[PDB]
Amino acid sequence: ALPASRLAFIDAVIAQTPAREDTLDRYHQYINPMMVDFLKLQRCDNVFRSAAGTQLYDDAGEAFLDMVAGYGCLNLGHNPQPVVNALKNYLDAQGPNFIQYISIPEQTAKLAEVLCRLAPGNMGRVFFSNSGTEAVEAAMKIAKASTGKPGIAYLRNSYHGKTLGALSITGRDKHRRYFTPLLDAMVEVPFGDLAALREALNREDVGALMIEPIQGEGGVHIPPAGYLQAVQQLCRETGVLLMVDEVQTGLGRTGKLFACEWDGIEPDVLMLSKSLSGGLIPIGATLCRADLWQKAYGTADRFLVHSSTYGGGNLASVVALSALREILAQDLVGHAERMGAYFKQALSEIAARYPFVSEVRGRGLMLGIQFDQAHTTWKFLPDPVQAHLRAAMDRMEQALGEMFCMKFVTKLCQDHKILTFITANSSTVIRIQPPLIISKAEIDRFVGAFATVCEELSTFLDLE
């Protein structure tokens, strides 16, 4: 009946392989009770015990096919062995890690050289951070410090991260709603609208523009035919920096090492994260022209102005170096294109048999599927009560659209053990974002399950 010591408590926690229920209890208590209740509600409250390649294994050992791939940080799949080996070996060699501001980091130097030479444009500099949002802040500050102007234009339905800097150029109200006011001088331009973008970019206080090659968390929209290039030229016209967020489209995901390659876009600043981790170690990178970095920070007061405690550690860089390598050795760029074209075709063929399935969009292995579905006593209710009931019912109607889409998510997980999800900005687009190592066998299996699910929901909408 006497209490354990701290250490014994901790020892007993670390060492235990806990029951799934106890893990579910623990999250619920100490992390996010709504998240738990939600997955339980969607009947996808999984506890994964192991992972390899395209598979996640639960606590009973059952396998799941992972089309989320950690929202895009798993291009190489779960636990890729060469990346794993690279990491292990570095540690065995007692390589130094977090020493990048007290000495010159050997491995980070390697990655910087590599990234710049592979990057599009004329990148000469890199700052290393630990995440997407952080890599975005880094670009933001470069824009600010080199131009001296505090403004940045962004496009509606952009997603650039959730730190408040990044949030200020994130074109989606559901994410920004609660944190007003954000930063002044950022400008939302409607998407694909170029005359409007001339207006925004002429503005005295605007130094830069931030775009994504394809908007991801904004429902997988490839820009129109001439847009990105026009944007590029317009930015040259106006003296504005072109800043390209490739945290999501980068590293072979759209069928090119960089999505920029599709339209010959030459950024002034570029942002990488997600899969640069090798799905192992958090990492971000921000590349820019050497001469911009010069205007930003090439002064004795300025050269350490932006810095990061973890950012640029040798370890992460060892990992990334190895991740990149594997993307290249395994022809995953080519696979993404090829398998990507195949998947899209195949899905489209199912989607043009179902009116609720509207469209299949994307490039390489970045895809989304869009759905599209759906007296006196009253006279003498107060107007307030009537207005309130009207509005609820309105908003409910729309939510009924996303509930339909989540119905897909749930059936795939529950009936077919396939993990998919929905994008953060739109809740009406299923993301389809497999690891790039994905097989034809696996693709075809996804195609059939999805046909099964359309075939079932069509019949549920038929008993009405």
Binding site for ligand PLP (CB under 6 A): 131-133, 136, 159-161, 212, 216-217, 245, 247-248, 273, 308-310
CA-CA distance, 371 to 381, in Å (whole number)?
A: 36
**Min CB(162)–ligand PLP separation in Å:** 6
Choose the stretch contacting a second copy; rule: CB under 8 A; options: 76-84, 187-195, 334-342, 446-454: 76-84
Residues contacting residue 297 through CB under 8 Å, at least 6 positions apart? 145, 303, 305, 306
Give a three-class secondary structure readout of the chain: CCCCCHHHHHHHHHHCCCCHHHHHHHHHHHCCHHHHHHHHHCCCCCCEEEEEECEEEECCCCEEEECCCHHHCCCCCECCHHHHHHHHHHHHCCCCCCCCCCCCCHHHHHHHHHHHHHCCCCEEEEEEECCHHHHHHHHHHHHHHHHCCCEEEEEECCCCCCCHHHHCCCECHHHHCCCCCCCCCEEEECCCCHHHHHHHHHCCCEEEEEECCCECCCCCECCCCCHHHHHHHHHHHCCCEEEEECCCCCCCCCCCCCHHHHCCCCCCEEEECHHHHCCCCCCEEEEEEHHHHHHHHCCCCCCCCCCCCCCCCHHHHHHHHHHHHHHHHCCHHHHHHHHHHHHHHHHHHHHCCCCCEEEEEEECCEEEEEECCCCHHHHCCCHHHHHHHHHHHHHHHHHHHHHHHHHHHHHHHHHHCEECEECCCCCCEEEECCCCCCCHHHHHHHHHHHHHHHHHHHHHCCCC
Kindly state whether residue 23 participates in binding a second copy, applying the rule CB under 8 A: yes
| Residue closer to Mg ion (CB basis): 310 or 354 | 354
| Token pair for 398 | 């729309």
Please choose, out of 169-177, 190-198, 370-378, 450-458, the segment that lies near a second copy by the rule CB under 8 A: 169-177
Q: Which residue is nearest to Mg ion (CB)?
A: 357
11 binds, among ligand PLP, a second copy, Mg ion, none (CB under 5 to 8 A by kind): a second copy
Query: To 5 degrees, how large is the angle CA 9–CA 12–CA 18?
Result: 125
| 139 lies in the site for a second copy, by CB under 8 A | no
Name which position in 10, 391, 392, 400 contacts a second copy (CB under 8 A).
10
Min dist. Cβ of residue 70 to ligand PLP (A): 10
Contact 158, 303 (CB under 8 A): no
Stretch touching a second copy by CB under 8 A, among 4-12, 339-347, 360-368, 377-385: 4-12
| Long-range contacts at 233-237 (CB < 8 A, ≥ 24 apart) | 234/194, 234/197, 234/198, 234/201, 235/201, 235/209
Pairing between strand 206-211 and 151-155? parallel
Residue from the set 279, 362, 364, 434 that interacts with a second copy by CB under 8 A = 279
Choice from 153, 210, 315, 351 touching a second copy (CB under 8 A): 315
Instruction: Report 339-398 residues binding Mg ion (CB under 5 A).
Output: 351, 354-355, 357
Question: Which residue number, 148 or 355, has a Cβ lying nearer to Mg ion?
Answer: 355
Residues in region 433-462 near a second copy by CB under 8 A: none
Query: Which of ligand PLP, a second copy, Mg ion, none does 160 bind, CB closer than 5 to 8 A by kind?
Result: ligand PLP
- Residue 60 makes contact with a second copy by CB under 8 A: no
The residue within the footprint of a second copy, chosen from 54, 322, 373, 423 (CB under 8 A), is: 322
Smallest distance from the beta carbon of 77 to ligand PLP, in angstroms? 18
* Residue 417 contacts a second copy per CB under 8 A: no
Binding to a second copy by residue 277, rule CB under 8 A? yes
Q: Measured from the CB of residue 271, what is the shortest distance to ligand PLP in angstroms? A: 7
Instruction: Report, in Å, the least distance between residue 224 CB and a second copy.
Output: 28
Least distance in angstroms from the C-beta of 359 to Mg ion = 7
- Told to check if 398 binds a second copy by CB under 8 A, we report no
Instruction: For residue 98, state whether it binds a second copy (rule: CB under 8 A).
Output: yes
Determine how many CB atoms are found less than 10 A away from the CB of residue 292.
21
Subset of 186-225 contacting a second copy (CB under 8 A): none
**Is 125 or 346 the residue whose CB approaches a second copy more closely?**
125
**Contact between 7 and a second copy (CB under 8 A)?**
yes
Work out how close the CB of 274 gets to ligand PLP at its nearest, in angstroms, rounded to a whole number: 6
The answer to the question of residue 182 lying near a second copy (CB under 8 A) is: yes
Residue from 299, 345, 398, 414 that binds a second copy (CB under 8 A)?
Answer: 299
Q: Does 131 bind a second copy (CB under 8 A)?
A: yes
Smallest distance from the beta carbon of 65 to ligand PLP, in angstroms?
A: 22
Using CB under 8 A, which of the segments 160-168, 227-235, 337-345, 376-384 binds a second copy? Answer: 160-168
Q: Which amino acid is at 456?
A: E
Q: How far is the CB of 97 from ligand PLP (least distance, A)?
A: 14
Binding residues vs Mg ion (CB under 5 A): 351, 354-355, 357
